[PDB]
């Protein structure tokens, strides 16, 4: 449970580390596309985090 919790946090940390911010140049519609795609993925990681953590917090 304590080692599970640590492993879940190291995992959540990995997920956040796997979605780094893209180059903010604002050059093309493709630059703002990447930002939109980054945000969706961030929100998803935020939601996956809360749900995983709530199983450890009760």
């Amino acid at each position, epitope marked *: 449970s304590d080692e599970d919790l640590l*492993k879940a946090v*190291r995992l959540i940390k990995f*997920l956040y580390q*796997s979605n780094p911010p893209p180059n903010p140049e604002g050059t093309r519609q493709a630059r703002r596309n990447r930002r939109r795609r980054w945000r969706e993925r961030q929100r998803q990681i935020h939601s996956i985090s809360e749900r*995983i953590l709530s*199983t*450890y917090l009760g």
Partner: antibody, heavy 117, light 110 residues
Framework: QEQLVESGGRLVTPGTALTLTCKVSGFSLSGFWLNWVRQAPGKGLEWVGAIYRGSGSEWYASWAKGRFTISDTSTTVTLKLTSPTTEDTATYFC????????????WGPGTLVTVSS | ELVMTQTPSSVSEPVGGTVTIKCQASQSISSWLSWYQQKPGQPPKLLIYDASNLASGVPSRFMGSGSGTEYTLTISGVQREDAATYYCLGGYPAASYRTAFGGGTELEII
């Protein structure tokens, strides 16, 4: 595109350490949950465990811990049966979660393990 | 830790009838619930994801719903090809309670 192929299924005597391999191909994704599911003949599906592919994050069912080891490779995910018994006779499938949302979208055809003397 | 109680164990229904399959979660899983169809000699196939969403390539007669701890798989106009065994999958691999399959439902068509 996305493909999973399991191999290593053999006839073994009890206590014979065995490794099954899930050949992972055509996945655009880097990190994803690669799950191991088993089915004894005429029985239901049972979750064994999973590994989150980018990391070394292994998760096991309460009954699976100590008896199974999931390991990640460059192009593969392995499942080692440390000390099999007759109760471990089953078809073992690998199943990938492509979204991180918990559900299994891609499955392998399975590999059969028979534990008998 | 997580236990998914699936009922009934077996159902016999004539072509055109409605099939109701239930899964009860031992812990709060929210939308972490999916339904699978398995036919002999084949791996299982995804039907419903996130409790109520229809998966790609699945007939519209397959419906998923969830209220708290109770989850339902409805097959409205049962066809001969729907004869199979059905399973729910609850939870998440990194959740404190892990992830678990229900005991399955064997559907036979009259």
């Amino acid at each position: 595109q996305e493909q999973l192929v399991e191999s290593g299924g053999r006839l073994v005597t009890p206590g014979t350490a065995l490794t099954l391999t899930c050949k992972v191909s055509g996945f655009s994704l880097s990190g994803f949950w690669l799950n191991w599911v088993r089915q004894a003949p005429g029985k239901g599906l049972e979750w064994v465990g999973a590994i989150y592919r980018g990391s070394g994050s292994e998760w096991y069912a309460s009954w699976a811990k100590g008896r199974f080891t999931i390991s990640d490779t460059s192009t593969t995910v392995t499942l080692k049966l440390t000390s099999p018994t007759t109760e471990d006779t089953a078809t073992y499938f690998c199943a990938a979660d492509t979204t991180d949302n918990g559900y299994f979208t891609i499955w392998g055809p399975g590999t059969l393990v028979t534990v008998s003397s | 830790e997580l236990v998914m109680t699936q009922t009934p164990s077996s159902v016999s229904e004539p072509v055109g009838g409605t099939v109701t399959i239930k899964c009860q979660a031992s812990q709060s899983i929210s939308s972490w619930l999916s339904w699978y169809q398995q036919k002999p000699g084949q791996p299982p196939k995804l039907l419903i994801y996130d409790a109520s969403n229809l998966a790609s390539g699945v007939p519209s007669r397959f419906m998923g719903s969830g209220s708290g701890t109770e989850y339902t798989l409805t097959i409205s106009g049962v066809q001969r090809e729907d004869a199979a065994t059905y399973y729910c999958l609850g939870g998440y691999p990194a959740a404190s309670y892990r992830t678990a399959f229900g005991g399955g439902t064997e559907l036979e068509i009259i």
